[PDB]
Amino acid sequence: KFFNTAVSAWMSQEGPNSDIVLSSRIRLARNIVDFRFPTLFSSEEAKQIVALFERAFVGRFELLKMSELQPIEKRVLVEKHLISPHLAEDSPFGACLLSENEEISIMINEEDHIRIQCLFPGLQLAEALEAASELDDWIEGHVNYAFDERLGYLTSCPTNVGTGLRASVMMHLPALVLTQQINRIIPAINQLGLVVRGTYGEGSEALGNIFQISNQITLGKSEEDIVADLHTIVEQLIAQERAARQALVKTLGIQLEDKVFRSYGILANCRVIDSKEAAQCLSDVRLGIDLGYIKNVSRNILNELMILTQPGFLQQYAGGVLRPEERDVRRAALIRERLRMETR
Amino acid sequence: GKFFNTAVSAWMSQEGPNSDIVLSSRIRLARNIVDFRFPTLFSSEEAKQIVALFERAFVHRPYGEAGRFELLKMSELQPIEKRVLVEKHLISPHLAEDSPFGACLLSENEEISIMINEEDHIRIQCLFPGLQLAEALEAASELDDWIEGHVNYAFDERLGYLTSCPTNVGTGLRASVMMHLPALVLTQQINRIIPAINQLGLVVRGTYGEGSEALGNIFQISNQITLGKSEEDIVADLHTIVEQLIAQERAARQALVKTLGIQLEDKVFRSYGILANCRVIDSKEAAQCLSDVRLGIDLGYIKNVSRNILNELMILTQPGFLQQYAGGVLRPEERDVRRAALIRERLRMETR
Ligand SMILES: N=C(NCCC[C@H](N)C(=O)O)NP(=O)(O)O
Ligand SMILES: N=C(NCCC[C@H](N)C(=O)O)NP(=O)(O)O
């Protein structure tokens, strides 16, 4: 079942630096030319492409067609970064070829005909790129990619023209945020051409201290060079976060243990919590788990509950519009329950 | 021995009338002994003779159901031990800190504390759980007469018992109740009630009397009038105002439940969440959270936490008792870590 908001067995595996790096994501955007039926209609191209993947994937993959999913199922796929918002809503023949472990997602008929996604836990960009490239090679053996031998892969949005590659890592940087170093690392990332965004919240507030660092640097660099560059910056960010964490432990000791356990205590017991406080507390709890203060709570609580406690998702899940105070009560209840599952 | 290592005696652990709000009822009777100068004037020789008088008369003396009296001399106790007795409300800060020749006769059940060389030669204290002012006054008056069979009180027909303090003039009677008034505090009402009560000849003080703060919204309501009113009327008048206070607190709770609803449940559970999980907590925060949790158990929000454990924790988390329980002296930051751990384990054993 792909619509389990919990961290998959695949994404809960401990990849390199997976305490700080939640996940590594490789996306390869492709468009197809010279269709098997040279149709003039996008409708027909989109259906041939779906037929291709339904015929060619029955490793176990399920082809999820957006037209066949309830809106909450599509929202979960969106929140799992398995599909884009555009695939859920705006793609009449949108479909997602999902591997059973949800490592592999091939979005069909979005902006581009093909978006191959590999999502790995921890810092495994090279592994994700290799896995995405193996599917890329498989797909290209059966279709012709729109490709200009001097411009590279042709993608609908010129955001991707060239390699069609977007590489991203999601990182939890509570210590850099706590010690107010985060706005020091943003310029270093921007100078290198990478893009850093908060994953959760509205415009740059980065709830949960979860950051997405991705490339933008396109035409010049090889895919391996894009990924090596991102990997290298991520490893420096990891080192900075670990240094900040170790400084925090050495300075605060029991006061840091107290901070993360109080955040735990709020999450385990509060009856009213807004998404911002929940995010801060979840980040603290995750840090406390990472530091081994909190020993009986899965670190995946951060990944899962950051999704489930978002205001819009919470309403989407509840099936209706909820006032903020109603959201805060349901959010607290959801969080308490998920932490009660950990106590058992 | 057990005076220092049990936070709440079996005696004080009994549920009393209205004991959810009224934690305790106390009657103190101040007296001086004829032929001894009062503690503000006496010599060290007189002070020692006073202790010796009470020692000879009352050490190990049986007092019925209360067990026998034990004599604790302040000079023979350490400041932590004395702080423990203050924190258990068995002796006054004055006796613990300001009476070199102070002593206290404690009943084995810790209902009775006869302080010696406090502000007066004798401060007879009877402590009852819940709202039991009539029973405490009866107990104290009985004990007063019983003691007076062994000492003669300085007494003037006009001025009553001659005491050292203007605040004991006449009856020497201080009747007090300890009340948990979290709703009146939260509704801001307490701000109007305190001056209103002060104008009726009562006074509202903190948890450890004059000059102390209301730890955990625990207020001491006591008479201010000691002279020109019978002891029964002083206590009856206090009781009447305590009953009104209970009524106001209960109404304030119902008002809070209706106006805050889940936010009140959130308030108490967050305090519970702190207590169950914090690793560092000072006694003041602990008291505030314990107050919230007590309110939460009173309103039925919080299950599996007894008033008994909350009573124990209110005492165990005090600095002296913490150091007593620890085994020795603790700096503030050590206290806060041991306090958090004590609370966590008591709350976790409370929920198992
Ligand atoms: N915005 C809210 N709640 C509003 C409460 C006011 C303020 N945040 C407070 O809690 O004090 N919830 P959401 O689901 O995170 O949007
Ligand atoms: N006075 C204190 N603590 C002072 C603050 C120390 C701070 N929590 C810290 O960790 O240093 N505790 P007490 O036992 O209530 O007297």
3-state SS class at B155: strand
For residue B129, CA distances in Å to A271, B135, B227 come to 33, 10, 26
Angle between helices A324-343 and A275-290 (to 10 degrees): 20
Copy the structure tokens of residue A231: 């990997």
| Backbone region of residue A204 per phi and psi (left: phi > 0; alpha: psi in -120 to 50; beta: other values) | left
Angle between helix A275-290 and helix A300-308 axes, rounded to 10 deg: 170
Instruction: Measure the CA–CA gap between B256 and B260, rounded to whole angstroms.
Output: 5
* DSSP code per residue over A82-109: SS-HHHHHH-TT-EEEEETTSSEEEEES
Beta carbons within 8 Å of A53's beta carbon, 6+ residues apart? A61, A63, A95, A97, A106, A108
Q: Which residues of chain B make contact with A262, given a CB cutoff of 8 A? A: 273-274, 277-278
B335 Cβ inside 6 Å of ligand 2: yes
Residue B330 near chain A (CB below 8 Å):
no
Provide residues with CB under 6 Å of ligand 1: A 274-276, 311, 324, 327-328
**Angle made by CA atoms B88, B90, B94, in degrees to the nearest 5:** 105
Grouping H, G, I as helix, E, B as strand and the rest as coil, residue B158 is: coil
- Determine, for residues A265 and B274 on separate chains, whether the beta-carbon distance falls below 8 Å: yes
SS3 A218: helix
- Is B279 close to A261, i.e. CB distance below 8 A? yes
Q: Could you say which residues from 154 to 173 on chain A have a Cβ atom under 8 Å away from some Cβ of chain B?
A: none
Of the candidates A286, A264, A265, A270, the residue with the CA atom closest to the CA atom of residue A208: A286
- Angstrom distance (rounded) from CA B243 to CA A321: 47
Pocket perturbation via mutation, ligand 1, pick of A205, A322, A328, A335 by most ligand atoms within 8 A of CB:
A328
Give the residue, by CA position, lying nearest to ligand 2 atom 7: B333
Quick one: tokens of A259?
A: 């901070």
Confirm whether residue B27 is marked as ligand binding: yes
Query: Treating both helix axes as pointing N-terminal to C-terminal, what angle do B262-277 and A254-269 enclose, rounded to 10 degrees?
Result: 150
Element (H, E) at A65: strand A61-65
SS3 (DSSP) at B305: coil
Q: Is the CB of B320 under 6 A from ligand 2?
A: no
The answer to whether residues A304 and A6 touch, using CB atoms and an 8 Å cutoff, is yes
Considering only CA atoms, which residue is closest to atom 3 of ligand 1?
A324
Token pair of B249, please? 């607190």
Cα distances (angstroms) measured from residue A136 to each of A150, A158, A338, B338, B344: 20, 19, 38, 59, 55
Amino acid at B42: F
H-run or E-run covering A211: strand A210-214
CB B178 within 8 A of CB B207: yes
Ligand 1 atom at shortest distance from the alpha carbon of A272: 10
Rounded distance between C-alpha atoms, residue B156 and residue B70, angstroms: 31
Q: B71 — alpha (psi -120 to 50), left (phi > 0) or beta?
A: beta
Q: Residues A194, A216: contact at Cβ < 8 Å?
A: yes
Grouping H, G, I as helix, E, B as strand and the rest as coil, residue A24 is strand
* Residue with CA at minimum distance from ligand 2 atom 10: B333
- DSSP characters for B32-83? -BTTS--TTT--HHHHHHHHHHHHHHHTT-B-GGG-BEEEEEGGGS-HHHHH
Is B259 within any annotated ligand binding site? no
Confirm or reject contact between B225 and chain A (CB < 8 A): no
A22, A7 in Cβ contact below 8 A? Answer: no
Tokens of B183: 């709703």
A14 CA: distance to closest CA in chain B (Å): 27
Residue A66: CA count within 13 A, CB half-sphere: 26
Distance of alpha carbon B241 from its chain centroid, rounded?
19
For residues A333 and A269, the answer to whether their CB atoms sit within 8 Å is no
Determine the Cα–Cα distance for residues B305 and B313; give it in Å rounded to an integer: 11
CB A28 within 8 A of CB A131: no
- Residue B177 annotated as lining a ligand binding site: yes
Interchain pair B277, A257: CB under 8 A:
no
Rounded Cα distance between A157 and A311, Å, is 30
User: B270 vs A268: CB contact, 8 Å cut-off?
Assistant: no
* B279 touches A at CB < 8 Å: yes
Method: X-ray
Type of residue at B212: S
Distance B338 CA to ligand 2 centre (A): 11
CA neighbor of B285 nearest in space, from B323, B336, B324: B336
Inter-chain CB proximity B279 and A254 less than 8 Å? yes
Q: A315: closest CA among A143, A71, A14, A87?
A: A71
Helix, strand, or coil here: B339?
Answer: helix
Q: Is A174 exposed, middle or buried (0-12, 13-18, 19+ CB in 10 A)?
A: buried
Q: What is the resolution of this structure in A?
A: 1.9
Decide if B132 contacts B118 (C-beta within 8 A): no
In sequence order, the 6+-apart residues with CB closer than 8 A to the CB of A175 are A241, A244, A245, A247, A248, A287
CB A183 within 8 A of CB A240: no
Other residues' Cβ atoms within 10 Å of the Cβ of residue A158: 11
Eight-class DSSP state of B151: S
Relative orientation angle of helices A71-79 and A311-318, to the nearest 10 degrees: 150
Sheet holding A61-65, edge to edge: A61-65, A95-99, A104-108, A114-121, A21-30, A165-172, A210-214, A195-198
Among the bound ligands, name the one nearest to the CA of residue B323.
2
Nearest CA to ligand 1 atom 1: A324
| Rounded-to-integer distance, Cα B29 and Cα B102, Å | 16
Two tokens, residue A256: 């840091």
What are the distances in angstroms from CA B148 to CA B155, B232, B302, B313? Answer: 12, 19, 48, 37
Q: How far apart are CA A284 and CA A273, in angstroms?
A: 15
Please state at what angle helix A311-318 crosses helix A300-308, rounded to 10 degrees: 70
SS3 assignment, position A222: coil
Q: Which of B292, B176, B197, B206 is nearest to B248 (CA)?
A: B197
Q: Which of B272, B274, B277 to mutate to test the interface with A (most CBs of A within 10 A)?
A: B277
Among the partner residues B269, B278, B340, nearest to A271 by beta-carbon distance: B269
Judged on CB neighbours under 10 Å (0-12, 13-18, 19+), A205 is exposed
Distance CA B21, CA B181 (A): 7
Residue A341 in tokens? 């599952």
- Cα gap A302→A314, rounded to integer Å: 16
Candidate from B318, B329, B336, B338 with most ligand 2 atoms within 8 A of CB, to mutate: B336
Q: Which of A261, A270, A329 sits opposite B278 (nearest CB)?
A: A261
φ, ψ of residue A165 in degrees (nearest 5): -105, 125
Q: Is B319 in the pocket of ligand 2 (CB under 6 A)?
A: yes
B329 ligand 2 Cβ < 6 A:
no
- The best mutation among B208, B274, B282 to test binding of ligand 2, ranked by most ligand atoms within 8 Å of the C-beta, falls on B282
The C-alpha atoms of residue A190 and residue A172 are separated, in whole angstroms, by: 18
The beta strands (E) that lie in chain B are given as: 22-31, 69-73, 103-107, 112-116, 122-129, 155-156, 160-161, 173-180, 202-205, 218-223
Which one-letter amino acid corresponds to residue A216? Q
Binning chain B into helix, strand and coil, the percentages to the nearest 5 are 50, 20, 30
The answer to whether the beta carbons of residues B180 and B307 sit under 8 Å apart is no
Ligand-binding annotation for B206, yes or no, is yes
Distance CA B125, CA A284 (A): 49
Give the minimum alpha-carbon distance from A31 to chain B in angstroms, rounded to a whole number.
53
CA distance A45 to A38: 8
Q: How far is residue B258's CA from residue B274's CA, in Å, rounded to a whole number? A: 25
Using an 8 Å CB-CB cutoff, list chain A residues near B300: none
Contacts of A270 in chain B (CB under 8 A): 266, 269-270, 273
Q: Is B68 annotated as a binding residue?
A: no
Q: How far is CA B319 from CA A310, B100, B326, in A?
A: 43, 22, 10
Q: Checking DSSP bridges between strand A195-198 and strand A210-214, what pairing results, if any? A: antiparallel
Cα(B352)–Cα(B345) distance, rounded to whole angstroms? 10
Distance between CA atoms of residues B267 and B292, nearest Å: 7
Please report, as a single letter, which amino acid is at residue B1: G
Angstrom distance (rounded) from CA B88 to CA B80: 12
Distance CA A222, CA B294 (A): 65
- A302 and A282 in contact (C-beta within 8 Å)? yes
Q: What is the CA radius of gyration of chain A?
A: 21
CA angle, residues A35, A39, A43, in degrees to nearest 5: 100
Whole-angstrom CA distances from B15 to A330, B19, B338 are 37, 6, 29
